Every structure is written in C-alpha cells, then in structure tokens.
Design a binder for this molecule. Structure first.
Ligand SMILES: [Ca+2]
Length: 139
C-alpha cells in the first residue's frame, strides 16, 4: 500500500515514476534555471533512465519549446556532466539531435528541443524543467 501513497506532487507538477516534474511558464538562462529549481527544493532535471528521457522528450516534442536540463560541460575537462556530478553515459549520446552537440562556440549547456537535445550558449533564455521526488504520506 505504501507505493500508492508515495505519488504526491505539488499542484501544476507532473508525476512520473516516483518523481515530480515542473515545466516553467517563462524563460531564464541556464544558471538562473539551476537556481530557480533550487528555490522550490528541486533540481534542474537530471535524467537517470531511458524511460525518463522518453517521458520528458515526448512533452517537449509536442510543445515546440526549448527547455534547459541539468547538463553542461562546465568543468576543467570539458566533459558532459549532470548537475549532480554524474557523467553523461555512453547510452545517452543517442539523445542529441542531429548536428549536436556542437562542442564549440561556448555552447556549454544542454536543452530539450524537438525529438532530442541540443547544446547551446548558456545565456540564452529557455524554459526549464525541475525534478524532485514524489512525497510519501497518508491521505
Ligand atoms: Ca549546439
């Protein structure tokens, strides 16, 4: 019975597989999107599974919106790393759109666009997506 009581999300957030997702109503740059999610006790979305990627990408592909995710190459090595410190894994490289990542022109931040991901300049104003765990409590 406990699973059924562990699906609580804030209003205007979407539940998927144990987490809650917020799609913003306005646009900010990448770093300000990181901070926006922190302010609501969440994180600019870090994708952990293919199923999660498919869920998120489907919301994007319908919308024609560009949305920041919690992924950048902002480190000494210049490697793609999620904001929780985890590296971008080999099996997720299939999610970049054709032509991406450019890995040039300081396109250091990742965004959802269409059926996949782009790298883009971090000063661009995009929508953003936050993720936080769903809450467990009685009803
Ligand atoms: Ca790019």
């Amino acid at each position: 019975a406990f699973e059924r009581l562990c699906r609580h999300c804030p209003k205007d957030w979407t539940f998927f597989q144990g987490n809650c997702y917020f799609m913003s109503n306005s646009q900010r740059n990448w770093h300000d999107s990181v901070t926006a999610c922190q302010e609501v006790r969440a994180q600019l979305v870090v994708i952990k599974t293919a199923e999660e990627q498919n869920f998120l990408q489907l919301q994007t592909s319908r919308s024609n919106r560009f949305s920041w995710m919690g992924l950048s190459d902002l480190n000494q090595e210049g490697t793609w790393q999620w904001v929780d410190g985890s590296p971008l894994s080999p099996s997720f490289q299939r999610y970049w759109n054709s032509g991406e990542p450019n890995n040039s022109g300081n396109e250091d931040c990742a965004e959802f666009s269409g059926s996949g991901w782009n790298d883009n300049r971090c000063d661009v104003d995009n929508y953003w997506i936050c993720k936080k765990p769903a809450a467990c409590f009685r009803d």
